[PDB]
Amino acid sequence: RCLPDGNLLQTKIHNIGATLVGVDKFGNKYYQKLGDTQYGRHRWVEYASKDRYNASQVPAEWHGWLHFITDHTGDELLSLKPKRYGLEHKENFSGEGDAYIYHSKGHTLNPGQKNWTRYQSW
Amino acid sequence: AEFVISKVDDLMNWARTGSIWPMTFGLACCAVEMMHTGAARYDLDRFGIIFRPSPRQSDCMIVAGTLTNKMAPALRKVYDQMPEPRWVISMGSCANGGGYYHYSYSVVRGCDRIVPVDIYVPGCPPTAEALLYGLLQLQKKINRRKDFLHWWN
Amino acid sequence: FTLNFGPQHPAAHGVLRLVLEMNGEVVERAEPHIGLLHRGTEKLIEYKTYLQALPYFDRSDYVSMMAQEHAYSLAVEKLLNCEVPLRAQYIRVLFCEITRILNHLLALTTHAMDVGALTPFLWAFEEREKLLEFYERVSGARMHASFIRPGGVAQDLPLGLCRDIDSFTQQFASRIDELEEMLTGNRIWKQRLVDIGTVTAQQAKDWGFSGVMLRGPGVCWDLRRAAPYDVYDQLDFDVPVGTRGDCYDRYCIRIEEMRQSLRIIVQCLNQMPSGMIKADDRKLCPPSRCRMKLSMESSIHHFELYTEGFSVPASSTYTAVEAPKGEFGVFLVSNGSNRPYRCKIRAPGFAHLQGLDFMSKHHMLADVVTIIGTQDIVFGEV
Amino acid sequence: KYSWETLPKKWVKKMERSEHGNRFDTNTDYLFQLLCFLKLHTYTRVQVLIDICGVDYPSRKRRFEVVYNLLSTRYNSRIRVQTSADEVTRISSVVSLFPSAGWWEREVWDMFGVSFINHPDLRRILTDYGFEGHPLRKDFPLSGYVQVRYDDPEKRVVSEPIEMTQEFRYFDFASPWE
Amino acid sequence: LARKGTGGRSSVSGIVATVFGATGFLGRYLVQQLAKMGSQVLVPFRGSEDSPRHLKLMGDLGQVVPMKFDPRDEDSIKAVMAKANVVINLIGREYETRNFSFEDANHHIAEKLALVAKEHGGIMRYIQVSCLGASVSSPSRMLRAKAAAEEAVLNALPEATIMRPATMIGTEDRILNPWSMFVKKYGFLPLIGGGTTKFQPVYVVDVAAAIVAALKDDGSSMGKTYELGGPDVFTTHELAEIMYDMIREWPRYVKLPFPIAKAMAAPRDFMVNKVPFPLPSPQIFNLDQINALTTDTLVSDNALKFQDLDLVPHKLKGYPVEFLIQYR
Amino acid sequence: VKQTTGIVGLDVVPNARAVLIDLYSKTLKEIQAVPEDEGYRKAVESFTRQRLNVCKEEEDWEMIEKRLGCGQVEELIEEARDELTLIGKMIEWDPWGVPDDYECEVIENDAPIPKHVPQHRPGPLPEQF
Amino acid sequence: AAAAAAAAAAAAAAAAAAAAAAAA
Amino acid sequence: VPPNSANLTEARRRVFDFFRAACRSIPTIMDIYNLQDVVAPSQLRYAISAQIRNNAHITDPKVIDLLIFKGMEELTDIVDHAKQRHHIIGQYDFLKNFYTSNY
Amino acid sequence: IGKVSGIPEEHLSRKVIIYSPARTATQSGSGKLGKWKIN
Amino acid sequence: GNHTAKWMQDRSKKSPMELISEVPPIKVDGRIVACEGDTNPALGHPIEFICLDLNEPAICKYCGLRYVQDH
Amino acid sequence: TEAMIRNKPGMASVKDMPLLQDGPPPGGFAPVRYARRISNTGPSAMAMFLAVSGAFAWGMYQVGQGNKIRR
Amino acid sequence: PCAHPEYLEAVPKATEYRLRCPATIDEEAIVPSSDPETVYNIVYHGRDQRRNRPPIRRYVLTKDNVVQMMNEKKSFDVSDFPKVYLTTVEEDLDTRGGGYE
Amino acid sequence: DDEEAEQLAKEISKDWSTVFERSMNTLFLTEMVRGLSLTLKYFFDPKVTINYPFEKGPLSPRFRGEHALRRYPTGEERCIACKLCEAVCPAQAITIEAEEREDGSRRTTRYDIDMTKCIYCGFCQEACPVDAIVEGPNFEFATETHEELLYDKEKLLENGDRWETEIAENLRSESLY
Numbered sequence A: 001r002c003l004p005d006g007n008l009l010q011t012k013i014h015n016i017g018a019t020l021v022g023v024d025k026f027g028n029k030y031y032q033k034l035g036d037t038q039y040g041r042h043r044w045v046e047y048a049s050k051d052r053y054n055a056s057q058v059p060a061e062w063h064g065w066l067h068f069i070t071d072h073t074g075d076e077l078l079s080l081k082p083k084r085y086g087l088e089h090k091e092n093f094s095g096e097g098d099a100y101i102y103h104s105k106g107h108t109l110n111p112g113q114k115n116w117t118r119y120q121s122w
Numbered sequence B: 001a002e003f004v005i006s007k008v009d010d011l012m013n014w015a016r017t018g019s020i021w022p023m024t025f026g027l028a029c030c031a032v033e034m035m036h037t038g039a040a041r042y043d044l045d046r047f048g049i050i051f052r053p054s055p056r057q058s059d060c061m062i063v064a065g066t067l068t069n070k071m072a073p074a075l076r077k078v079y080d081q082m083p084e085p086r087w088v089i090s091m092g093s094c095a096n097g098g099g100y101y102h103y104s105y106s107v108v109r110g111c112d113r114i115v116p117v118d119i120y121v122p123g124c125p126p127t128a129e130a131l132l133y134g135l136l137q138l139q140k141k142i143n144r145r146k147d148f149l150h151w152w153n
Numbered sequence C: 001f002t003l004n005f006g007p008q009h010p011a012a013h014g015v016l017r018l019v020l021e022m023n024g025e026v027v028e029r030a031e032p033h034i035g036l037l038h039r040g041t042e043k044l045i046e047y048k049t050y051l052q053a054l055p056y057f058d059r060s061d062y063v064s065m066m067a068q069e070h071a072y073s074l075a076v077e078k079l080l081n082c083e084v085p086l087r088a089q090y091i092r093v094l095f096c097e098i099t100r101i102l103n104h105l106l107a108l109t110t111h112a113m114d115v116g117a118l119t120p121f122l123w124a125f126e127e128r129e130k131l132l133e134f135y136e137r138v139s140g141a142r143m144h145a146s147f148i149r150p151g152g153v154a155q156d157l158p159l160g161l162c163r164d165i166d167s168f169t170q171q172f173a174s175r176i177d178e179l180e181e182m183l184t185g186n187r188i189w190k191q192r193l194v195d196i197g198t199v200t201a202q203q204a205k206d207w208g209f210s211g212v213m214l215r216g217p218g219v220c221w222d223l224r225r226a227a228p229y230d231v232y233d234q235l236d237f238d239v240p241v242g243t244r245g246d247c248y249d250r251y252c253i254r255i256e257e258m259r260q261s262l263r264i265i266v267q268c269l270n271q272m273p274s275g276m277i278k279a280d281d282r283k284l285c286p287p288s289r290c291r292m293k294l295s296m297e298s299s300i301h302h303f304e305l306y307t308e309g310f311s312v313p314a315s316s317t318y319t320a321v322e323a324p325k326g327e328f329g330v331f332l333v334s335n336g337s338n339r340p341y342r343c344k345i346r347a348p349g350f351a352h353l354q355g356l357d358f359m360s361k362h363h364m365l366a367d368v369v370t371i372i373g374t375q376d377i378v379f380g381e382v
Numbered sequence D: 001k002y003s004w005e006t007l008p009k010k011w012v013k014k015m016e017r018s019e020h021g022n023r024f025d026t027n028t029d030y031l032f033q034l035l036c037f038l039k040l041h042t043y044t045r046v047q048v049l050i051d052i053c054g055v056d057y058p059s060r061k062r063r064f065e066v067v068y069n070l071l072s073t074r075y076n077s078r079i080r081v082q083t084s085a086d087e088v089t090r091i092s093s094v095v096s097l098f099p100s101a102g103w104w105e106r107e108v109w110d111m112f113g114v115s116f117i118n119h120p121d122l123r124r125i126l127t128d129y130g131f132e133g134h135p136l137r138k139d140f141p142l143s144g145y146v147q148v149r150y151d152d153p154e155k156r157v158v159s160e161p162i163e164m165t166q167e168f169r170y171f172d173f174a175s176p177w178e
Numbered sequence E: 001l002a003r004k005g006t007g008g009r010s011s012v013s014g015i016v017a018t019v020f021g022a023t024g025f026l027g028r029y030l031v032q033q034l035a036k037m038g039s040q041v042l043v044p045f046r047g048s049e050d051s052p053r054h055l056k057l058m059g060d061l062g063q064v065v066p067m068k069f070d071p072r073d074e075d076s077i078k079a080v081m082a083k084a085n086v087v088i089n090l091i092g093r094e095y096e097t098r099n100f101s102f103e104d105a106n107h108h109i110a111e112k113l114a115l116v117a118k119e120h121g122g123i124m125r126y127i128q129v130s131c132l133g134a135s136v137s138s139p140s141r142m143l144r145a146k147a148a149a150e151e152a153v154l155n156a157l158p159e160a161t162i163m164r165p166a167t168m169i170g171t172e173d174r175i176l177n178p179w180s181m182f183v184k185k186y187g188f189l190p191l192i193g194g195g196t197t198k199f200q201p202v203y204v205v206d207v208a209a210a211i212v213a214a215l216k217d218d219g220s221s222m223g224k225t226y227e228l229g230g231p232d233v234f235t236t237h238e239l240a241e242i243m244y245d246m247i248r249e250w251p252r253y254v255k256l257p258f259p260i261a262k263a264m265a266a267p268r269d270f271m272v273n274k275v276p277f278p279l280p281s282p283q284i285f286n287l288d289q290i291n292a293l294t295t296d297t298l299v300s301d302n303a304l305k306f307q308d309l310d311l312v313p314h315k316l317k318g319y320p321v322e323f324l325i326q327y328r
Numbered sequence F: 001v002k003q004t005t006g007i008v009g010l011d012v013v014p015n016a017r018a019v020l021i022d023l024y025s026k027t028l029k030e031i032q033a034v035p036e037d038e039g040y041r042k043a044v045e046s047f048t049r050q051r052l053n054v055c056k057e058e059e060d061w062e063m064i065e066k067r068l069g070c071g072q073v074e075e076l077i078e079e080a081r082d083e084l085t086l087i088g089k090m091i092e093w094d095p096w097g098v099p100d101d102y103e104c105e106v107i108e109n110d111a112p113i114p115k116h117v118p119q120h121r122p123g124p125l126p127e128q129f
Numbered sequence G: 001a002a003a004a005a006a007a008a009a010a011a012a013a014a015a016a017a018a019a020a021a022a023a024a
Numbered sequence H: 001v002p003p004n005s006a007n008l009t010e011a012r013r014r015v016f017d018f019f020r021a022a023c024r025s026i027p028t029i030m031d032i033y034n035l036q037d038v039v040a041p042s043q044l045r046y047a048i049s050a051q052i053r054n055n056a057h058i059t060d061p062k063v064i065d066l067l068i069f070k071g072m073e074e075l076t077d078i079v080d081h082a083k084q085r086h087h088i089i090g091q092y093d094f095l096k097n098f099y100t101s102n103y
Numbered sequence I: 001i002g003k004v005s006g007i008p009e010e011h012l013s014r015k016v017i018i019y020s021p022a023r024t025a026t027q028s029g030s031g032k033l034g035k036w037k038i039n
Numbered sequence J: 001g002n003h004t005a006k007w008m009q010d011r012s013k014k015s016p017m018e019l020i021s022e023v024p025p026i027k028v029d030g031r032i033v034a035c036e037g038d039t040n041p042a043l044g045h046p047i048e049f050i051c052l053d054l055n056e057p058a059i060c061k062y063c064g065l066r067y068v069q070d071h
Numbered sequence K: 001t002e003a004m005i006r007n008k009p010g011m012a013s014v015k016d017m018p019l020l021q022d023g024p025p026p027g028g029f030a031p032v033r034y035a036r037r038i039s040n041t042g043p044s045a046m047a048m049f050l051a052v053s054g055a056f057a058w059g060m061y062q063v064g065q066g067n068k069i070r071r
Numbered sequence L: 001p002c003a004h005p006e007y008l009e010a011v012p013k014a015t016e017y018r019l020r021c022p023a024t025i026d027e028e029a030i031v032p033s034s035d036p037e038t039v040y041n042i043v044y045h046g047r048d049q050r051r052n053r054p055p056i057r058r059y060v061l062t063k064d065n066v067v068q069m070m071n072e073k074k075s076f077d078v079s080d081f082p083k084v085y086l087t088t089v090e091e092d093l094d095t096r097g098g099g100y101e
Numbered sequence M: 001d002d003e004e005a006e007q008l009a010k011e012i013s014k015d016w017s018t019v020f021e022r023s024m025n026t027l028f029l030t031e032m033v034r035g036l037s038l039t040l041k042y043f044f045d046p047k048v049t050i051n052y053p054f055e056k057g058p059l060s061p062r063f064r065g066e067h068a069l070r071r072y073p074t075g076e077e078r079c080i081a082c083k084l085c086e087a088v089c090p091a092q093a094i095t096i097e098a099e100e101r102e103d104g105s106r107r108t109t110r111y112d113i114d115m116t117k118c119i120y121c122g123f124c125q126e127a128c129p130v131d132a133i134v135e136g137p138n139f140e141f142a143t144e145t146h147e148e149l150l151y152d153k154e155k156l157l158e159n160g161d162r163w164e165t166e167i168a169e170n171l172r173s174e175s176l177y
Ligand SMILES: CCCCCCCCCCCCCCCCCC(=O)O[C@@H](COC(=O)CCCCCCCCCCCCCCC)COP(=O)(O)OCCN
Pocket: C187, C188, C191, K048, K052, K053, K056, M026, M027, M028, M029, M030, M032, M033
């Protein structure tokens, strides 16, 4: 706890009756409080980064279960993530310095700024 | 030491990130999605965001919908009368970039042509949570300000 | 005395830029300024195929999305002669009517928030965020569900959508009652609305109102009873028609039209035939993913329907449905090619917002936002 | 159709259709006179100008085709009187009959350029204020001529310079064999 | 340069500039010229990321790339000038700040950017911007520093253009905007030295148009210290006469002898002493700006003027001063 | 006895039959000024004669409506007065007759339209009562 | 001002459907 | 306004009418947009006349009608504060091309 | 009708080519011929 | 590769060309194969029938998978 | 195709294809209310006036007795 | 004492609603594409709708034809007139079904 | 007429113990206290709100969010460069350039979706023959700068490999439609 400075207190006021369904690699604890009441508020995630958290830290294995699109906890879709090309999440580093943010291939901030001139000069 | 400066920046940023009232230039549907992001389910009054109806006192300006070439001067005139610690959020494809109407003669190719933008909520009809996450990214942009440390150079 | 009455509350009426020529507090003329939301829709559609043209329609009226896709689809089936199944018609109405509810839930309580009642807005928007759990579930996007395609409808309902629409319709009479108990009885409401923007029927006809502003005045004219364009000739529902024409009749209609739309939803649910979802004519309806991959002749059509298009034959028709705003009709001249040719979009709000000039004459300046309320003026269509 | 028997033959001058909504492609001179008929008539009572659709055929000689739609709330029928007026032919305005025609004709003049006779307040409704050019024509390029608008040292002002953008990619989907 | 376009705002001009002083009053016009004639601009900012936000527009999607850099730390200046062929230098101060002294902000930086551009062989044109009359033995320590900056940018890097703009007028300037908001001391304008100063202001748009014109020029304008003077050689009092024409106010000047001013600006000159508090940027009364105000050397001599750039400056009446209307 | 027309603005007229007789006699008298061999005059004469006849025969407004199945007598008066306006207008800018060239191209496209498309259905016949 | 004031009196609420309730 | 231009004479008459209108309206133009100091009335009259003369070779009457209509539109949007002022101040050999582009 | 058309001056001195697009050599089908286009 | 050096600047994750050139060719029985996609004929590419008359493996154009006769 | 996408092992014929899609359960849904059921079971016109008048009749007597005690 | 006649008891908070989350395939839908009679009988020109239409018959009327028609139209007897769309208003509170649809 | 309409609409409620009923409703707010009572019932009822970052709104496998170029289980980008999505795109966001790679099988040298110039209508997901381009349910990719929002040629749309675990699930559950 010790955060009376966030809405994280609203999540920690949840979890009082909720059951913990799995926890992904990053530490985000995925909770479920069904049966009681208030559909739409019976699946959430405790981000395990009580500060500096934001959305999109929820990996794709769980981002289904947590938006109610599926009923497969990330401990069940982890047997379906492709091993050959599977890639870990990236938290959406939007703005947090260059080389973390994404860059196109001509942005002059991207190492290896490609030239698009279709004609090959002499 | 510098620690006092670090904490006074943390405090200023906590203020400007807690109470960030946007002048919601709700043009078009992304204003209907913004109204859903102001509605009961995804509260914006929870995060402090209070939709101001006037440009005079507003920390932000969530331009949404198709910025028309005729509503470009009005958007600029509204942006020029916000108090200096202001930010702009582009919500929807039509507001952030050219969008469905990139090649329309009457549509500016993204408000990035009129006002300087700080967070582009992506998705042409952004989910109400997506605009909410765009605002939770504007909150990060505040938390990376440290204006006092820069005033001390 | 000229006053540049702009958008009082932004994010509700976005680009409203009236220029009121007042007389003290009495308005002498209201001159609306259009074009602030004039995206090049009636030009951009001439440049794209009949499939690429459909997403503009959900973006024409932003509070009642699928009604315009349903008005466009019925204008590229009027030409194509593309007979759609019974299930496509029933889904198409169950969503045109869910859209009537999605619009009246907004255009009532956004109006009721301009008048001043703050809570009906948020209750109706919880209801709308329940109906967008249907839009978003059946197509994908909560608002712009490019779902009512020309032939039939994009793709079948998920296997749990009628149960959820039922579990919503059971609890929706109560929400209308609350929106009604909070606004209909109030003396601060009636006072703010009775004898406001009264439109004699000759005026609602002259100015081509043709909506909930043509049934306020008492003209019994609903293009679901006049020109039944779907199962509407099978579905039972009573069109509420006002007797005075004041903005308090149009509100009472929009709050009854939100119950008859509930009747139509419950009927479309209780009688939805298990048939094909799109027209069997695979040269107007892209074949399913399963078929185009397995069948070579389906793959060719999936290629020439997602690149070339229909090439609907040469004609010119005005297909008008009863969108929530009013008679939304899309006059679709069609050169033989795969791209439309001057897909003109008659959109109510271009004819209604004309009415603001005579509706709000001699009304007080604070009424000029109530008029804009009951006209359901959404500037995407204007 | 009853409307064609009573109507003076000269008024339905050029054309007449019989499906997809019936139309009386008339002449521009007999238009508001033809719109006077079909309204204020006992057996043809339209009273409702639904729409005024400018349509531009560049390959014609009378380029535009001002398609007046008309609903008849009484007899439950819809007639589409049309016209044909090129870029410099002022066409009769029917704002005097159906006052809804005001904004529709402002839009027809704005988009196309078919000025309307004795139409009070015939002023560009949709396009920008300083807009030169008529968009919904055919020869008007999609991206517009000078229609980019950006902020600049002329502070608080968005200029209107010549336009430059990612080139609109026109795809030649149209296949032979129609 | 390798220009592939027609006008700008999507064209290319082969000028991937790094306008070192872009987040400043001169910088916003120069960046707009360079990025409206369609060329990349690598605007480097010093502190708050809100500094170059007004420059993310006026350039089309990466034509203006604001970058972070520390003025005293190299290996970051080299990173800002990594992909660049033009390097303009607008980094200058009119007031000493407790952290950066006059030399460490006017001379010891311009020399540093000059050296780290020399090392990064490929900077075709390096423009160096310093005030007019910034010659050694000038009273104002700002002009002595700005003269040493010219001498060190030419030595350490020859064929490097040097604009010499005189006090630049325009919106958000440091010459007229302090006088107004001091006319808001009830029309009381304290023209110092009695308005005997003779200085040639210039519309900042035209200083920018000259800074870009030495880029679009040929091999010439290299190592040739221009003097972007402007028209209508004025006097401080006479220039103030034109302000009161725009802002509706009645001329109510006073004369201040130079000792009185230098005593009134004796505070805010303990900048190096008052460590635990930064002073509020002396706007009108600046002991160094006053030392410059004394001698009217701010006049264009027979050195290169706008005429040697096919360019003629705008006047100082009408639009090039119409930013004062916002004070009426 | 009629309380009110549901339509707003169309005020209930007590003397419906009398003003209807007046208007239809005026119409029959004024239509004489158009050439006889014009479809407009045959139509006006025929329906004005039918409505004037049924208005003279029946007495109550309700029976006028019931036999003459054309809505309400207030809307009927609106129609008759608008018809008088049209006949007094048609006298001016006389469009009667056909000029020699008279090129009128009747165009018929018979493509069937799908049933589930807005098709203006006829509506109830005058057996509504 | 002689402008027509909005008289908040009217006829009592009676839901007025169309005649097609039972048999069109 | 009906196109009474059944001949170049009526069209020219209404051209002179529009010219007199614009000239007699120049006062408000100079007032609302503040050109009474940058531009002289002689110069604004010069510009209006150079406009009406630049398009004087129009043997078509209806084209002149439409030109006068566009001009009245421009004026009415300049008289009122519909358009701004920084354009009104602006509204008022082969080798040197070859060196710039290929077009 | 060039001046009333609002087209800017610099785009009415343009030099066009009024061709008729030949048949796409790849496909032997004449369903796109006879449609003259300004170029 | 060089084509893959135009869109991928990572150069640490194996290039898709190698990811498909390192999967072994699939033995089969007849002279024609299906390669409907991954496994589910509705989640793979349109079915592409490949000929195995040659001795070398015949790649599936859409998926890169390789098939050999296995006589 | 369309007989290889909807298999239903057996079926001997192109009809009797699976055809399992969403719809109302057998027997439809429950009868959904749409009318306005606003219960007017509150205090009547009287009982509200007589509670107010009764409170005035007794409570003002109590104000009087309290004024007597205070005096 | 309010809008709660044992009918608002249908409350908005559902708590058991979308019990089967959408992307969970408990039942695999089928969504028929084509009618069974049109699977192995793919003759199209009979089923065609785009192109299976009568051609446009645009024939000219000259003055002779229309004067012939005007002389042929002897009288406008009833049933040569367009029928009126008769629609009257009628007050009804909740009688359709009893408020239950 | 409005004068007589008023006289009659006030002579309808003109019988004692009905004038009293209406007087009491005006004298003591009755309709308004039914507004306050409903408002109170909602003041005490549970709140339909969602503390967003920790729990998010319900979606569906058909939800259209961040576009992702899928891959075949064995690497090999699924995107053969047919350009059908570049053709079907209403906003023309996708720019595809194709080159026969050295392996010989066609692939896109440039597959850049411009998300800002993109309407998220899912036409690309439908048009693509092999399901190469799909919309991942991400929808949370608000970017500080516009240039990042233009999704590069097959490199950032190649981040769908992270979202494949959810995209493969949504496709396995939607393919029945
Ligand atoms: C049942 C208990 C009611 C308690 C209500 C508490 C509400 C408090 C919070 C505020 C409520 C909302 C405020 C609304 C403001 C507008 C109120 C208003 O003015 O309403 C009407 C007037 O209402 C009032 O003035 C209410 C004040 C009540 C005071 C006492 C009334 C008579 C008391 C009789 C006493 C009987 C016994 C005395 C002798 C024995 C105005 O008339 P109209 O235009 O609405 O309609 C008729 C037009 N001619």
